[PDB]
Design a protein around this ligand. Structure first.
Ligand SMILES: C[C@H]1O[C@H](O[C@H]2[C@H](O)[C@@H](O)[C@@H](O[C@H]3[C@H](O)[C@@H](O)[C@@H](O)O[C@@H]3CO)O[C@@H]2CO)[C@H](O)[C@@H](O)[C@@H]1N[C@H]1C=C(CO)[C@@H](O)[C@H](O)[C@H]1O
Ligand SMILES: C[C@H]1O[C@H](O[C@H]2[C@H](O)[C@@H](O)[C@@H](O[C@H]3[C@H](O)[C@@H](O)[C@@H](O)O[C@@H]3CO)O[C@@H]2CO)[C@H](O)[C@@H](O)[C@@H]1N[C@H]1C=C(CO)[C@@H](O)[C@H](O)[C@H]1O
Length: 500
């Protein structure tokens, strides 16, 4: 993949400013694209866009295909009279997910009722047409969500056996009994894709490419796992027999047990990797590039017996990454994938990435805790530049927040390294900019930065803190917070580093 030298910004849509408690796919999203274009940015990166559950993590979605109903802009609906919106008291600068769950679901439900009553024939037709075209994943997703709502939010593998095991007769009866609930969820999808499609066209009109994000492993409690038990290592009761994670290492003697169901790779290969082809086809309708989290899992993954409460009991298992990507190349004619390969250092993963021209990542906040051999330091990046450099990702603190808690060593080495690259700073608040500048001076073809670093926000704006119980995925921009001055500063930096 040939990436021209450029820069972009990382901003999950929920973080957009605007009324009604959460960023949505509307004017403010368009304002951000405009800001990005004026700043000279050519990429907008988001986190996974699927529907979320308790904890609100984009990385644990009810579906590998559905769009997050919380991102639906309700204004176009209120404007056609389908619903009357009333702010129950959403805060500024953050998403109160508890309130959004309590208020937005009913507002979408009311909107659907108003729609059935007032929609024009053209809208009814379009929605029906959408349900037909997307049936191959929508039938399962909409029934999955209807069943979930009818069984008190229980995970699919705790539902009555006939439904859990998808006995046809039982599914047909449920689909019939929950007809309006199924149509309602299908309605949230039609709105989500219509709005995303419009936003994507806006991005394209502005010369902007969108980098989507798809975790390599799906979630246990999701429509596709329920509908395709044959593609995952589950027992007869739908329980994963092995789960994803990573082994212990110098950092943790317990490793990480993520819990995700794992693929029956032999079955997927036999089916021409249909699940993955479908997954990518759907994603390519929404994005120009797809970042895949834990890309190394296509080469080998840490398989943990589900009975083990930690990650200590696993073993590395080879996956057919080569054949899968050969299949992806064959079908799509290119592999529009960005590999999340943080801390892999394994040769075979690098080789698989390179074989298909896939860029990896570099995160500057991790470059100063040791020596000059640290792979995250710019002089160590590959001369071919097929890598995306970030100051920090959604899992890291903002760079100012990181700086304030960095070790004396990190702070001193960073400053010295910056100076070696002709960069300096005076106040703490300037560190995010100095690091963004260091990334832009690097050979990395793409430099992508979280908006919180553009705003030089502290720890209060950190998107996600892995391991922390609450406050995650909630940060939001305030109206007008990204000023023309922020854009001009990014633009001047891009111009100087030849990224325009
Ligand atoms: C306040 C709370 O709002 C959100 O909570 C809702 C979840 O998104 C829903 O999916 C639903 O969760 C139920 C599960 O579906 C069901 O399978 C079962 O496990 O019971 C769950 C509880 O009913 O309903 C949730 C609301 O009740 C949001 O996702 C969640 O993160 C929010 N919780 C935050 C607030 C506090 C209060 O200090 C903390 O305990 C949490 O760590 C925060 O994340
Ligand atoms: C659901 C999960 O969401 C968050 O975790 C994800 C990260 O945000 C992603 O960036 C991605 O990171 C991993 C890299 O892809 C991988 O290559 C390696 O570097 O490890 C990274 C994470 O250590 O994927 C993460 C999901 O694996 C969030 O931080 C995390 O806390 C959330 N976990 C919830 C799920 C379970 C399972 O029941 C519980 O154990 C946790 O307490 C929940 O918070």
């Amino acid at each position: 993949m040939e990436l021209p030298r450029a820069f972009g910004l990382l901003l999950h849509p929920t973080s957009l400013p605007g009324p009604y408690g959460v960023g949505v796919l509307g004017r403010e999203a368009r304002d951000f694209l405009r800001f990005l274009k004026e700043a000279g940015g050519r990429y907008w990166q988001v986190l996974p866009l699927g529907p979320t559950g308790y904890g609100d993590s984009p990385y644990q979605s009810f579906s590998a295909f559905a769009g997050n109903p919380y991102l639906i802009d309700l204004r176009p609906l209120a404007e056609r009279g389908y619903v009357r919106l009333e702010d129950p008291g959403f805060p500024q600068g953050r998403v109160d997910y508890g309130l959004l769950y309590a208020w937005k679901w009913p507002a979408l439900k009311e909107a659907f009722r108003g729609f059935k009553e007032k929609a024009s024939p053209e809208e009814r037709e379009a929605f029906a047409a959408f349900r037909e075209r997307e049936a191959w994943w929508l039938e399962d997703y909409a029934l999955f969500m209807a069943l979930k709502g009818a069984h008190g939010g229980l995970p699919w593998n705790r539902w009555p056996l006939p439904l859990r095991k998808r006995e046809e007769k039982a599914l047909r009866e449920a689909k019939s009994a929950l007809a309006e609930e199924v149509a309602f969820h299908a309605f949230t999808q039609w709105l989500f894709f219509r709005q995303w499609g419009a936003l994507k066209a806006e991005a394209e009109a502005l010369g902007i490419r969108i980098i989507g994000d798809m975790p390599i492993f799906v979630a246990e409690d999701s429509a596709e796992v329920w509908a395709h038990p044959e593609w995952f290592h589950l027992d007869e009761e739908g329980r994963p027999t092995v789960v994803a994670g990573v082994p212990p290492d110098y950092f943790s003697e317990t490793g990480q047990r993520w819990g995700n169901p794992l693929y029956r790779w032999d079955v997927l290969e036999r089916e021409g990797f249909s699940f993955w082809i479908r997954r990518l086809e759907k994603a390519l309708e929404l994005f120009h590039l797809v970042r895949i989290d834990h890309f190394r899992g296509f080469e080998a993954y840490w398989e943990i017996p589900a009975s083990c409460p930690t990650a200590v009991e696993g073993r590395w298992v080879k996956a057919p990454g080569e054949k899968l990507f050969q299949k992806i190349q064959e079908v799509f004619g290119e592999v529009p994938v960005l590999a999340e390969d943080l801390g892999v250092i394994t040769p075979e993963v690098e080789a698989l990435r390179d074989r298909f021209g896939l860029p990896g990542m570099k995160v500057l906040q991790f470059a100063f805790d040791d020596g000059m051999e640290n792979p995250f330091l710019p002089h160590n990046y590959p001369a071919h530049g097929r890598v995306v450099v970030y100051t920090g990702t959604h899992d890291n603190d903002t760079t100012l927040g990181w700086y304030r808690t960095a070790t004396p060593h990190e702070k001193a080495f960073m400053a010295r390294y910056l100076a070696d690259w002709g960069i300096t700073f005076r106040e703490e608040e300037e560190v995010p900019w100095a690091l963004m500048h260091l990334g832009m001076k690097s050979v990395a073809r793409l430099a992508v930065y979280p908006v919180q670093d553009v705003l030089a926000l502290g720890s209060e704006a950190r998107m996600n803190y892995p391991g922390r119980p609450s406050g995650n995925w909630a940060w939001r921009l305030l109206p007008g917070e990204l000023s023309p001055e922020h854009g001009a500063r990014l633009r001047a930096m891009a111009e100087a580093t030849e990224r325009l």
